[PDB]
Write a protein that binds this ligand. Structure first.
Ligand code: MET
Length: 531
């Protein structure tokens, strides 16, 4: 099937200002989308804000302003932040959007007509902060923000409350066997694998029916009314998951504004998502509830859900009051945007709860970006080594020449597989193994000596080096979107060769291609001191 590659981030609660967790999640979404665009594919990358619910409504009561003004303010902060992070997102969705509401009502009605929604009661624990139902097995003792004894989530640590309400219930219990068929039929549908094992384990134990409405007062009327029952509002999560569907059905103008909701998802060829990027904290919603709603509705299921871990700074929690902040924009201004992105994508894989420190950030920037990549780019383009300022024509290749050429020929196939898992960390490591190899080849050949001694040999060494740089840079362009453009400018790679699987091929830029012009003091990544 040939379709728009559809990649999504979670839509984030707007109870509070955007922070690193959100930036990271969206960054992951952005990178995947960026990579599929360089393969020449149509892409629709989606992010947004989850704006209804008790959590958000109460967050706005605390700051003492209307939910409409509050959600709009905070959403504005999310957009401003993401614009500043210089992503390439195709649309920003807000669940307050009127067309989103229509799609929710449409899906709800499908589930009802299917016979999968009945009137019942939920009597059990709820975490408002997580907007999540919990069994007693998943709560424990703790202290509220007074210090008085309460119950809290084992998952999250937030206060839980007992809820006893007549609610509309989705028949999730009836989807146990089909969800199990699905997980087993598509053993790559949840990444990383140990999270796939989590979901299976959980669904194996058994599934209770799920409350998909709440009484309207409980939600302070800040939700979507249940169609046909104005006393009930639709569960914030059923509403929020529907954003993926809504997004697949919106025609967007050049300004980034929704202008039309199509009746059928096929019209736009986006749905279902090829990758839902998420955090591990919201796995059940995406891997259990969502495919269950889609099965009931008769909709296609997503191809992959990839769930990453949580961040710490200096081996502690990120928190304003505890005195340990990590501001992505602040660190980008300090170290650079592409560098910070490299770090967050390099320093941790999706199975790990990684760690930012200034020390280790500077170690990677200097180590990998400046010495390994940065220096290689400057040398092979320098007037000292590349005296004619062009891509030379290679002479005959030695076996050592060819060992390196093989590594470069093999790199795209390997990096491709990693980006498709997806495992962005592994893709980066693969590209830098090839970069380390190029540097060691250069050390061996000492092109600086060859310039005097053997210009004919230099032609070969220099051409291999330029091409190795070009290919590695191409495959890193989704990680270093701005720096890759600079690198390609220095190399003098024509625009047409900066994109497309055609240009993953060794030798796509011809000898004789001229290098771009130099500047007095220019440097790709400048070293920074340690303390
Ligand atoms: C459909 S994704 C919803 C995610 C939720 N709003 C959160 O911030 O965790």
């Amino acid at each position: 099937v040939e379709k728009v590659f559809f990649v999504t981030s979670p839509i984030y609660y707007v109870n509070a200002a955007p922070h690193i967790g959100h930036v990271y999640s969206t960054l992951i979404t952005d990178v995947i989308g960026r990579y599929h665009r360089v393969k020449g594919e149509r892409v629709f990358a989606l992010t947004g804000t989850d704006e209804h619910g008790q959590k958000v409504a109460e967050a706005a009561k605390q700051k003492q302003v209307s939910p409409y003004d509050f959600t709009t303010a905070v959403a504005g902060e999310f957009k401003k932040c993401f614009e500043q992070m210089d992503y390439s997102i195709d649309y920003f969705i807000r669940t307050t959007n009127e067309q989103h509401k229509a799609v929710v009502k449409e899906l709800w009605t499908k589930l009802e007509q299917k016979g999968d929604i009945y009137l019942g009661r939920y009597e059990g624990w709820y975490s408002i902060s997580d907007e999540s139902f919990l069994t007693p097995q998943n709560i424990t003792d703790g202290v509220d923000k007074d210090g008085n004894p309460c119950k809290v989530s084992l998952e999250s640590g937030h206060v839980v409350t007992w809820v006893s309400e007549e609610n509309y219930m989705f028949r999730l219990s009836a989807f146990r066997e089909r969800l199990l068929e699905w997980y087993h039929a598509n053993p790559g549908c949840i990444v990383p694998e140990f999270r796939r094992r989590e979901v299976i384990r959980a669904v194996e134990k058994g599934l209770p029916d799920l409350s998909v409405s709440r009484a309207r007062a409980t939600l302070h009327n800040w939700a979507i009314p249940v169609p046909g029952n104005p006393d009930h509002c639709v569960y914030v999560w059923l509403d929020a998951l529907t954003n993926y569907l809504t997004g697949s059905r919106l025609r967007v103008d050049e300004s980034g504004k929704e202008v039309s909701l199509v009746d059928d998802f096929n019209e736009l060829e986006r749905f279902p998502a090829d990758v839902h990027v998420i955090g591990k904290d919201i796995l059940k919603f995406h891997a259990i509830y969502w495919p269950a709603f889609l099965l009931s509705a008769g909709l296609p299921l997503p191809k992959k859900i990839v769930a990453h871990g949580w961040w710490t700074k200096d081996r502690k929690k990120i928190s304003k009051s505890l005195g340990n902040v990590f501001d992505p924009v602040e660190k980008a201004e300090e170290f650079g945007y592409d560098a910070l992105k490299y770090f967050l994508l390099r320093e941790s894989g999706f199975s790990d709860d990684g760690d930012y420190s200034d020390k280790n950030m500077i170690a990677r920037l200097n180590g990998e970006l400046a010495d390994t990549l940065g220096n290689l780019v400057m040398r092979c383009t320098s007037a000292k080594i590349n005296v004619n300022g062009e891509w030379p024509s290679p002479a005959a290749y030695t076996e050592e020449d060819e060992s390196l050429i093989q590594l470069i020929k093999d790199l795209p196939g390997t990096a491709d597989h990693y980006y498709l898992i997806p495992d962005i960390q592994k893709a980066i490591i693969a590209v830098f193994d090839v970069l380390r190899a190029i540097n060691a080849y250069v050390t061996d050949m000492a092109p600086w000596k060859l310039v005097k001694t053997d210009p004919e040999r230099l032609r070969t060494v220099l051409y291999i080096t330029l091409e190795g740089v070009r290919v590695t840079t191409l495959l890193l362009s989704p990680i270093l979107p701005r720096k890759s453009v600079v690198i390609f400018d220095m190399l003098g790679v024509p625009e047409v060769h900066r994109k497309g699987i055609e240009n993953f091929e060794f030798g796509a830029v011809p000898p004789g291609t001229r290098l771009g012009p130099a500047v007095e003091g220019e440097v790709l990544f400048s070293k920074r001191s340690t303390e």
